[PDB]
């Protein structure tokens, strides 16, 4: 009768682990998605009844790997392009005043300099247009802004910056769990788990104050943060209805091409065909003011029921984090959002808003400092339309007496952009070997 | 919100014996020691641990929402100010003297 040990191979059991997921895509561009196994036309998904798991973002390891992987693909695409070492010279600039408005007074400069030709013993005189945010005066003659911190590099204008959806699949012996609860927090027990072979299509779009082209919530507005009473932690808001934002670069740009030596080309900026006007983004004033109302209801649940809630504009910092910075069609924008966060909500028109933007060409993408990049001009007129699907906030500290909480837009760390998409997944490792007692015993022969 | 109150404004125990200081603090908690005209220095963080490089005379324990700081085998130089902080909020510390 005395029970004996029996051995089972293939029992459903798993623990937590870390590995290297590989990525899969559909069907040239920076993210090198032409070195990704092609996806399959069958997203199989299995539901797991009666089982509740424990999720915890802000410690998810799928985020620390999406970060280091797109920092590595970004550098891989700059290794074969043109080094612009001859461009740190002395420039001789002049204001552009040909059919401008009065807002663009001083935003464009017309600089002339000496460049190297294809022969080591000949020089050429050349001009090009530069934005004011890219040159500095030598002694109050200009120079590019990066020439005392790093070297610039940019060619390969046949590589696009358009984001492409990317699926992260797991190797053999591992699995990806997925929480299907609709009112899910960051952490805690999710009682409606399910398993997949790889995630949905994630777009690697980068931005600073608003989250763009992301995914929406299904029930209502969600508010996630680790230790909301610690004012050194950001807050992640997620809308349930998108807000549109139309942006444009209304100037008609032309593009020269300068042979600096053999087989090297520099893409300057020629004259502009028409008038010089400012770039901007238009947002519908009614829709925006409404969703801002749906955010203060959820924001009130964490604080007292009769608290005053204010929105203010950013308080300082670098240009990347004090504005809404994004990339639309190969140009990099920096828009002044000080007209969106300006209001005060206490308890108990039909037009648009216009946000003015600036443009830069010397980009230092990730906080790394020793290597910048140039961005060639784009021909024609730029225009894009995007969905706003979230915010990144930051609460003012030192608030006692339990009244008048103040929030300001934040950002800067791109990991918060990935946590807004990978908060549903976790990686487990299968343990297919188990023992148990039973009555059978091995037949001695 | 955050509540915080500590309880001997200033005791006047002498050399040798041991004393305790109690802070009532909702939500983490730390203890600091600051001589006159000097920058403070950390003794005990999270309410129970102690920083590497401090005599083991100091040690604290927690129960409910009341924390305790107590020092054993008083010394001629352990007379200074002691206060407890939670995160932006601090309190006017206590003074001990022989």
């Amino acid at each position, epitope marked *: 009768e005395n029970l004996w040990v029996t051995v089972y191979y293939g029992v459903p059991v798993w623990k937590d682990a870390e590995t290297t997921l590989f990525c899969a895509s559909d069907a040239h561009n920076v993210w090198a998605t032409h070195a990704c196994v092609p996806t399959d036309p069958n997203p199989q998904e299995i539901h797991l009844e009666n089982v509740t798991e424990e999720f915890n973002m802000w410690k998810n390891n799928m985020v620390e790997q999406m970060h280091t992987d797109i920092i590595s693909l970004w550098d891989q695409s700059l290794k074969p392009c043109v080094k612009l070492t001859p461009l740190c010279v002395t420039l001789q600039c002049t204001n552009v005043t040909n059919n401008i408005t009065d807002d663009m007074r001083g935003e464009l400069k017309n600089c002339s300099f000496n460049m190297t030709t294809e022969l080591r013993d000949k020089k050429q005189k050349v001009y090009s247009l530069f934005y004011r945010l890219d040159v500095v005066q030598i002694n109050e003659e200009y120079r590019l802004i990066n020439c*005392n*911190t790093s070297a610039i590099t940019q060619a390969c204008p046949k590589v696009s910056f358009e984001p492409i959806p990317i699926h992260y699949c797991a190797p053999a012996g591992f699995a990806i769990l997925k929480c299907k609860d609709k009112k899910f927090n960051g952490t805690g027990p999710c009682p409606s788990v399910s398993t997949v072979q790889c995630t949905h299509g994630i777009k690697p779009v980068v931005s600073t104050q608003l989250l763009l082209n992301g995914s929406l919530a299904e029930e209502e507005v969600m508010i996630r943060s680790e*230790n909301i009473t*610690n*004012n*050194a932690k950001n807050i992640l808001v997620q809308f349930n209805t998108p807000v549109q934002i139309n942006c444009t670069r209304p100037n008609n740009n032309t593009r020269k091409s300068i042979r600096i030596g053999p087989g090297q080309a520099f893409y300057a900026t020629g004259d502009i065909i028409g008038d010089i006007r400012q770039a901007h983004c238009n947002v519908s004033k009614a829709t925006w003011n409404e969703t801002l109302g749906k955010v203060v209801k959820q924001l009130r649940k964490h604080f007292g029921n009769n608290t005053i809630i204010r929105f203010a504009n*950013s*308080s*300082g*910092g*670098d240009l*990347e*984090v004090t504005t809404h910075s994004f990339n639309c069609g190969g140009e990099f924008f920096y828009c002044n959002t000080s007209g969106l966060f300006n209001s005060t909500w206490i308890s108990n028109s039909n037009d648009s808003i216009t946000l003015p933007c600036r443009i830069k060409q010397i980009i230092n993408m990730w*906080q790394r*400092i020793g290597q910048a990049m140039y961005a060639p001009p784009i021909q024609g007129v730029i225009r894009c339309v995007s969905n706003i699907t979230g915010l990144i906030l*930051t609460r*003012d*500290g*030192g*608030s006692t007496n339990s009244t*008048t909480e*103040t929030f300001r837009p*934040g950002g*800067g*760390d791109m990991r918060d952009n990935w946590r807004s998409e990978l908060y549903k997944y976790k990686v487990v490792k299968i343990e297919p070997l188990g023992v148990a007692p039973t009555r059978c015993k091995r037949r001695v022969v | 919100d955050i509540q915080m109150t500590q309880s001997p404004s200033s005791l006047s125990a002498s050399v040798g014996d041991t004393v305790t200081i109690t802070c009532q603090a909702n939500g*983490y908690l*730390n203890w600091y020691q600051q001589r006159r005209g000097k*920058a*403070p*220095k*950390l003794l005990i*963080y*999270d309410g129970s641990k102690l*920083e590497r490089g401090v005599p083991s005379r100091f040690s604290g324990r927690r129960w409910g929402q009341e924390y305790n700081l107590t020092i054993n085998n008083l010394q001629p130089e352990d007379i200074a100010t002691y*206060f407890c*902080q939670v*995160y*932006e*909020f*601090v*309190v*006017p*510390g206590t003074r001990l003297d022989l």
Partner: nanobody
Amino acid sequence: QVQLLQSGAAVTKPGASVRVSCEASGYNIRDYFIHWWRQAPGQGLQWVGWINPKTGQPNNPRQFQGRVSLTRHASWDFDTYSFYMDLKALRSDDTAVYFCARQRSDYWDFDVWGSGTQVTV
């Protein structure tokens, strides 16, 4: 060593500004927030506010809004960081001593402090 060097004392008339510096020397500077505290004669400490040194972003309480400015600056060898606090509209109450401090973890446990700088009007 993880020292946080600070600058000397200063005194000026009301209605004027003042700048106080604080150097960071011996660790990974870009991974820890920097806080500024203030102590008045015969009082407890007071939180002036924190700064993130990677992006450079400040955070101040409602009492100091519009008067304090926290900034930072690095050098082209990236080893040294200089943090600055600027106060704009001085009064008699701003007579105090100011402390640079380096947060260490999510307990807000400040293990290293600066010497402190006394400034009065």
